[PDB]
Amino acid sequence: ACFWPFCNWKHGCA
Amino acid sequence: CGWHLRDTTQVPSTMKVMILDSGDPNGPLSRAVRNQLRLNGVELLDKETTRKDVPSLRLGKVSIAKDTASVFRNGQTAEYQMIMTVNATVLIPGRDIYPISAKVFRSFFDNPQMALAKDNEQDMIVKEMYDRAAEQLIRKLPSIRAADI
Amino acid sequence: RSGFLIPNAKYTTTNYFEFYLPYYWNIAPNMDATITPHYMHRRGNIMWENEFRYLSQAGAGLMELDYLPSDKVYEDEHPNDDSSRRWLFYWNHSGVMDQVWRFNVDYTKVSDPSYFNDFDNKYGSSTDGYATQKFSVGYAVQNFNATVSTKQFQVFSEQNTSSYSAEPQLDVNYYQNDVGPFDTRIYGQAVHFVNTRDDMPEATRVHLEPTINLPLSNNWGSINTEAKFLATHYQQTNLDWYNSRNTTKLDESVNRVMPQFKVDGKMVFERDMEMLAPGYTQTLEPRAQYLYVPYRDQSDIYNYDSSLLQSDYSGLFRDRTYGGLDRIASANQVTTGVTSRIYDDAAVERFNISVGQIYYFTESRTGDDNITWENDDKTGSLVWAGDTYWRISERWGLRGGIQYDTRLDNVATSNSSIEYRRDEDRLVQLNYHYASPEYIQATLPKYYSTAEQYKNGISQVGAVASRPIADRWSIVGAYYYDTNANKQADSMLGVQYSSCCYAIRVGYERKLNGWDNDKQHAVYDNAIGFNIELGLGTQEMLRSNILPYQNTL
Ligand SMILES: CCCCCCCCCCCCO[C@@H]1O[C@H](CO)[C@@H](O[C@H]2O[C@H](CO)[C@@H](O)[C@H](O)[C@H]2O)[C@H](O)[C@H]1O
Ligand SMILES: *[C]C(=O)N1[C][C]N(C(=O)[C]*)[C][C]N([C@](*)(=O)[C]*)[C][C]1
């Protein structure tokens, strides 16, 4: 589910 | 027109069955050399082989250097020159060790604005240079064969 | 064994009188360190430099930490800035462990864009436009390799520092040869792109490509067919700002799925030169390639990591026009090339010349075709390339290369070199580099084509010489001259007296060290230093300038 390294974590939770 | 189709193989007949040795058997240069040898119809034996009297190709040092070939009027780099040099040896069983070498030049323009992209470019360039290093060493095999005779 | 080294001194025009006071430290057989106070007078302080070299199971590495607590010149040129300290951190580490685990580290961080111009060039260069920060851990075996990597960059350009970083990147390859007649290969990638800006696009990309190729070879001919299937998925976020300014709209999800068909063929004709030379063999190698890639609209994707590649003779047969995986242009083209090789009596290749061209049937489109070509030619014979290499004797040789573009209607790039080298201490070399202003306008960013320091192109002539005297001295010189500007770019001189117990070296260099934005001329930096140490050192001195010497044979 969580792809924490390979995902949009800078602006994604906006 | 004296041009005739080649009747001999790129790799000499004596070196059709050979051993490949290196400290980096799993590196990109070893992969490139192995591909070039398997294309030229060369059968590669393991170094442990009890089968003696087969020649040995030992890959050695590989060094890649990125230098500044030219600069702009402000002194910033314009062209980056990638130079790859590879040293290797060929042992003919019972006769002698013959050293061989390969050197590949390439260049690419620098672009700080697209720095990441340029990095990828550099990677691709390096991946090509290994291939150029693999075809060069093979083209030097007949020189070894004539030297042995 | 741990003690003070012999001191070193220099007189520059940016730090004036300089003084090194090195202190070695053998900590262990595998670790050593050196602490160097570097007093600089114009900046009126001491830069503490610390080097630490280590050999370990993981590999070999060097760490450098340079810290100048306060600076007067930087304070004067930045009166309103918070602090005037300067610092550099460098970390290089390469190594392979148990023949499978590959560890690579190349980290460089500086406090300000002007660091390299203002201080020594051991691991940096005033010519650098940016600093790199890469980490890589990989696992490689014979038919598999994987790698997790981080890429970051610190651009020194004030106009636009903004750069994209591939903080996570995964590169999985698998090879399965001898699958019947065919040979198979698979490549996978997962990357997350982040920008330093808070208003630039951010994306995660997942890429997969299978590859199947049939090689068939004879003693004279080689024909290889190849089929690839590229599949890419983009998830892009933080795209409001881009769409509020540009008419092209970026999509949040993009799927690009294209095949690639490639055919390569090459022949080997041979003849025996008789009148020209006895027992000399000439080889004529024709090579042809057809490439087909269909067109997809990439306007919904920002160009994160795709840049136009140079097209040398070897690059003519490369299937890609851009790098990375963002801009994959359509392809309907045939490339033809010929190589002639000369082999002497000892079967040693003494000469080779190459020439080739690319002929397009359809325009290479990518959806975001904004390249400023000088003319509107889209199909036909568009790109030409050529190379030559001649080994005249044991001590003499020359090289050359040229690339021509009809879209630029000009020779894009050229190079030439000719070298006389008896040995490491005695050699002479002459080289030339060219790059048309049209090529600069087409490939480099827009502000390059308008700025005076970039818009003119490249036309550079270099001469390098090294002559020993009485097998104890070694006079080394180099001169680089820009013929458009009719101005020196880099010049150096050096003398080394190498005895059995000491080797004194004195050097001088004048180099381009920046642009002045007000008087519209270049800033030159001069440096004269002496170095005592407890070969004649020719190669070390040849590599000391910003345009280092390279062996051309
Ligand atoms: C195809 C066979 C392979 C052999 C390849 C070896 C080629 C060796 C290249 C040596 C030539 C380099 O020098 C060549 O001459 C001049 C000198 O500036 C350049 O010429 C270019 O710049 C000058 C001014 O600077 C202009 O006069 C000219 O109109 C412009 O085209 C050529 O574009 C360059 O290519
Ligand atoms: C660890 C995890 O689950 N992540 C996904 C959940 N989220 C959000 O849903 C906003 C945080 C942001 N991320 C990503 O988008 C990849 C990473 C962690």
Side-chain angles (χ1 to χ4, degrees), chain A residues 1-12:
Chain A
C2 190
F3 293 104
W4 166 71
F6 299 103
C7 55
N8 290 327
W9 47 248
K10 184 177 179 181
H11 298 105

PDB file of all heavy atoms in Angstrom, chain A residues 1-12:
ATOM      1  N   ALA A   1       0.835  -1.194   0.000  1.00  0.00           N
ATOM      2  CA  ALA A   1       0.000   0.000   0.000  1.00  0.00           C
ATOM      3  C   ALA A   1       0.868   1.242   0.000  1.00  0.00           C
ATOM      4  O   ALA A   1       0.850   2.026  -0.940  1.00  0.00           O
ATOM      5  CB  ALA A   1      -0.928  -0.001   1.195  1.00  0.00           C
ATOM      6  N   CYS A   2       1.628   1.415   1.075  1.00  0.00           N
ATOM      7  CA  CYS A   2       2.568   2.524   1.178  1.00  0.00           C
ATOM      8  C   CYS A   2       3.810   2.203   0.358  1.00  0.00           C
ATOM      9  O   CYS A   2       4.425   1.144   0.548  1.00  0.00           O
ATOM     10  CB  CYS A   2       2.940   2.766   2.639  1.00  0.00           C
ATOM     11  SG  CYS A   2       3.876   4.291   2.938  1.00  0.00           S
ATOM     12  N   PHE A   3       4.169   3.105  -0.556  1.00  0.00           N
ATOM     13  CA  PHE A   3       5.377   2.952  -1.354  1.00  0.00           C
ATOM     14  C   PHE A   3       6.408   3.988  -0.933  1.00  0.00           C
ATOM     15  O   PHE A   3       7.138   4.527  -1.765  1.00  0.00           O
ATOM     16  CB  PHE A   3       5.080   3.070  -2.839  1.00  0.00           C
ATOM     17  CG  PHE A   3       4.251   1.940  -3.389  1.00  0.00           C
ATOM     18  CD1 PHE A   3       2.909   2.151  -3.664  1.00  0.00           C
ATOM     19  CD2 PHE A   3       4.785   0.690  -3.614  1.00  0.00           C
ATOM     20  CE1 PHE A   3       2.120   1.127  -4.158  1.00  0.00           C
ATOM     21  CE2 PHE A   3       3.994  -0.343  -4.112  1.00  0.00           C
ATOM     22  CZ  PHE A   3       2.661  -0.118  -4.382  1.00  0.00           C
ATOM     23  N   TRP A   4       6.489   4.265   0.384  1.00  0.00           N
ATOM     24  CA  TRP A   4       7.127   5.480   0.902  1.00  0.00           C
ATOM     25  C   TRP A   4       8.353   6.022   0.192  1.00  0.00           C
ATOM     26  O   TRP A   4       8.403   7.219  -0.064  1.00  0.00           O
ATOM     27  CB  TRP A   4       7.490   5.331   2.380  1.00  0.00           C
ATOM     28  CG  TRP A   4       8.410   6.434   2.757  1.00  0.00           C
ATOM     29  CD1 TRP A   4       8.133   7.767   2.892  1.00  0.00           C
ATOM     30  CD2 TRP A   4       9.790   6.277   3.044  1.00  0.00           C
ATOM     31  NE1 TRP A   4       9.281   8.445   3.242  1.00  0.00           N
ATOM     32  CE2 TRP A   4      10.309   7.543   3.348  1.00  0.00           C
ATOM     33  CE3 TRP A   4      10.638   5.173   3.080  1.00  0.00           C
ATOM     34  CZ2 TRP A   4      11.639   7.732   3.688  1.00  0.00           C
ATOM     35  CZ3 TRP A   4      11.944   5.355   3.406  1.00  0.00           C
ATOM     36  CH2 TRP A   4      12.443   6.624   3.711  1.00  0.00           C
ATOM     37  N   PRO A   5       9.367   5.224  -0.105  1.00  0.00           N
ATOM     38  CA  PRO A   5      10.438   5.767  -0.943  1.00  0.00           C
ATOM     39  C   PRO A   5       9.934   6.208  -2.304  1.00  0.00           C
ATOM     40  O   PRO A   5      10.067   7.376  -2.649  1.00  0.00           O
ATOM     41  CB  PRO A   5      11.428   4.614  -1.044  1.00  0.00           C
ATOM     42  CG  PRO A   5      10.650   3.403  -0.724  1.00  0.00           C
ATOM     43  CD  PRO A   5       9.559   3.795   0.201  1.00  0.00           C
ATOM     44  N   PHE A   6       9.262   5.325  -3.039  1.00  0.00           N
ATOM     45  CA  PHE A   6       8.946   5.557  -4.450  1.00  0.00           C
ATOM     46  C   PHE A   6       7.511   6.044  -4.578  1.00  0.00           C
ATOM     47  O   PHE A   6       6.626   5.385  -5.115  1.00  0.00           O
ATOM     48  CB  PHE A   6       9.160   4.287  -5.243  1.00  0.00           C
ATOM     49  CG  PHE A   6      10.596   3.783  -5.207  1.00  0.00           C
ATOM     50  CD1 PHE A   6      10.938   2.700  -4.401  1.00  0.00           C
ATOM     51  CD2 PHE A   6      11.610   4.415  -5.906  1.00  0.00           C
ATOM     52  CE1 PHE A   6      12.231   2.242  -4.327  1.00  0.00           C
ATOM     53  CE2 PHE A   6      12.903   3.948  -5.841  1.00  0.00           C
ATOM     54  CZ  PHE A   6      13.215   2.871  -5.050  1.00  0.00           C
ATOM     55  N   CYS A   7       7.322   7.287  -4.166  1.00  0.00           N
ATOM     56  CA  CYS A   7       6.040   7.999  -4.220  1.00  0.00           C
ATOM     57  C   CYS A   7       6.189   9.508  -3.981  1.00  0.00           C
ATOM     58  O   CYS A   7       7.280  10.009  -3.738  1.00  0.00           O
ATOM     59  CB  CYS A   7       5.044   7.384  -3.229  1.00  0.00           C
ATOM     60  SG  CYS A   7       5.736   7.369  -1.597  1.00  0.00           S
ATOM     61  N   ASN A   8       5.101  10.240  -4.075  1.00  0.00           N
ATOM     62  CA  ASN A   8       5.107  11.689  -3.961  1.00  0.00           C
ATOM     63  C   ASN A   8       4.913  12.112  -2.512  1.00  0.00           C
ATOM     64  O   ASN A   8       3.785  12.298  -2.039  1.00  0.00           O
ATOM     65  CB  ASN A   8       4.017  12.298  -4.828  1.00  0.00           C
ATOM     66  CG  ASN A   8       4.317  12.164  -6.290  1.00  0.00           C
ATOM     67  OD1 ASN A   8       5.478  12.206  -6.698  1.00  0.00           O
ATOM     68  ND2 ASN A   8       3.285  12.051  -7.098  1.00  0.00           N
ATOM     69  N   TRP A   9       6.018  12.278  -1.800  1.00  0.00           N
ATOM     70  CA  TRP A   9       5.977  12.652  -0.401  1.00  0.00           C
ATOM     71  C   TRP A   9       6.343  14.105  -0.114  1.00  0.00           C
ATOM     72  O   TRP A   9       6.296  14.507   1.052  1.00  0.00           O
ATOM     73  CB  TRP A   9       6.879  11.695   0.407  1.00  0.00           C
ATOM     74  CG  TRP A   9       8.239  11.449  -0.165  1.00  0.00           C
ATOM     75  CD1 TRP A   9       8.687  10.272  -0.687  1.00  0.00           C
ATOM     76  CD2 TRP A   9       9.333  12.364  -0.236  1.00  0.00           C
ATOM     77  NE1 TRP A   9       9.984  10.406  -1.104  1.00  0.00           N
ATOM     78  CE2 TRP A   9      10.404  11.681  -0.835  1.00  0.00           C
ATOM     79  CE3 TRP A   9       9.508  13.695   0.137  1.00  0.00           C
ATOM     80  CZ2 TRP A   9      11.628  12.283  -1.072  1.00  0.00           C
ATOM     81  CZ3 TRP A   9      10.724  14.293  -0.100  1.00  0.00           C
ATOM     82  CH2 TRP A   9      11.767  13.591  -0.700  1.00  0.00           C
ATOM     83  N   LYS A  10       6.710  14.902  -1.115  1.00  0.00           N
ATOM     84  CA  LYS A  10       6.966  16.321  -0.864  1.00  0.00           C
ATOM     85  C   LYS A  10       5.679  17.131  -0.839  1.00  0.00           C
ATOM     86  O   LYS A  10       5.455  17.930   0.074  1.00  0.00           O
ATOM     87  CB  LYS A  10       7.920  16.899  -1.919  1.00  0.00           C
ATOM     88  CG  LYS A  10       8.287  18.344  -1.625  1.00  0.00           C
ATOM     89  CD  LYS A  10       9.294  18.909  -2.618  1.00  0.00           C
ATOM     90  CE  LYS A  10       9.615  20.372  -2.283  1.00  0.00           C
ATOM     91  NZ  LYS A  10      10.588  21.017  -3.214  1.00  0.00           N
ATOM     92  N   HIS A  11       4.816  16.930  -1.829  1.00  0.00           N
ATOM     93  CA  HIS A  11       3.577  17.686  -1.941  1.00  0.00           C
ATOM     94  C   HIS A  11       2.340  16.797  -1.990  1.00  0.00           C
ATOM     95  O   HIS A  11       1.255  17.297  -2.297  1.00  0.00           O
ATOM     96  CB  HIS A  11       3.586  18.597  -3.179  1.00  0.00           C
ATOM     97  CG  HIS A  11       4.653  19.647  -3.174  1.00  0.00           C
ATOM     98  ND1 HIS A  11       5.785  19.564  -3.951  1.00  0.00           N
ATOM     99  CD2 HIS A  11       4.745  20.815  -2.493  1.00  0.00           C
ATOM    100  CE1 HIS A  11       6.537  20.631  -3.743  1.00  0.00           C
ATOM    101  NE2 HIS A  11       5.929  21.403  -2.860  1.00  0.00           N
ATOM    102  N   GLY A  12       2.473  15.498  -1.712  1.00  0.00           N
ATOM    103  CA  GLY A  12       1.394  14.571  -2.014  1.00  0.00           C
ATOM    104  C   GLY A  12       0.203  14.689  -1.087  1.00  0.00           C
ATOM    105  O   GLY A  12      -0.946  14.593  -1.529  1.00  0.00           O
TER     106      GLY A  12
END
